[PDB]
Amino acid sequence: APTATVTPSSGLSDGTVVKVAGAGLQAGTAYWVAQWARVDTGVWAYNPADNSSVTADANGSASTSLTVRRSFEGFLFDGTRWGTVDCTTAACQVGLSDAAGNGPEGVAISF
Amino acid sequence: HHHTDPEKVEMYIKNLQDDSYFVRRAAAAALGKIGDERAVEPLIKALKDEDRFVRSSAAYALGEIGDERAVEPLIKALKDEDWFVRRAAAVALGEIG
């Protein structure tokens, strides 16, 4: 049961720096911290511009900063350009994901 | 043709060499978005990456750029072992002509 925190998570601005924290992760495992959005049924687009790979410590925790965007040009798993994602209307979250696919449930972010 | 910070382009170009396929794939997608010609040669090298989603992302970026240099490498990638990479290459070639 790994968990994820985003501080702050509400009332964001385009360019806000947020603290992304993971707890209960697998020690020594890399997690991609990215801003995601569900743009359509079964469609998830990522912000390719602001993302970091953080590696979990012995205790199963990792921490990084993330620059959140209200609006971004979204990409799919295979590098397909989806188009503009607007976080005022689209369901935007911040996610920590390992190479498998696993890791915690994405933390919803609101502007 | 997008007015982008050249330091940002250099960073995404260095990121195509990262340990995380996620970082490499993200960098390849971001380079296509930027549409700079300086990313052409480093993205061509990425068409030979060990990850299927890095290779396809690099192929989509190259097509978005529209540079002719990518024609020979994209034809090679059309024979790639992965279906998504082959589909990316086909599209990227069509985004050039």
Author numbering:
A (entry chain A): 2 to 112
B (entry chain C): 8 to 104
Question: Can you provide the manuscript's text about this entry?
Answer:
Target NCS-3.24 is a β-sandwich protein. Additionally, this protein is a variant of a bacterial protein, neocarzinostatin (NCS) with a limited set of substitutions previously engineered in one crevice of the protein. The structure of the NCS-3.24/bNCS-16 complex was determined to 2.6 Å resolution with two copies of the heterodimer in the asymmetric unit. The structure of bNCS-16 is very similar to those of A3 and bA3-2 (rmsd of 0.4–0.7 Å over 60–95 Cα atoms). In the structure of the NCS-3.24/bNCS-16 complex, the C-cap of the αRep protein (residues to 105 to 139) is not visible in the electron density due to partial degradation (residues 125 to 139, as observed for bA3-2) and to high flexibility of the remaining region (residues 105 to 124). The NCS-3.24/bNCS-16 complex involves an interface area of 720 Å2, with 17 residues from NCS-3.24 contacting 17 residues from bNCS-16. Ten out of 17 interacting residues from bNCS-16 locate within the N-cap of the protein while 5 and 2 interacting residues are from internal αRep repeats 1 and 2, respectively. Among the eighteen residues from NCS-3.24 involved in bNCS-16 binding, six correspond to “variable” NCS positions (Trp33, Trp37, Tyr47, Asn52, Phe78 and Ser98), and are therefore different from the homologous positions in the wild-type NCS, explaining why NCS-wt is not recognized by bNCS-16. In addition, the side chain of Trp33 from NCS-3.24, which runs parallel to the THS1 steroid rings and hence plays a predominant role in its binding rearranges by 90° so as to interact with helix 2 from the N-cap and is no longer available for the stabilization of THS1. ITC titration of bNCS-16 with NCS-3.24 yielded Kd and n values of 1.4±0.3 μM and 1.4±0.1 respectively.
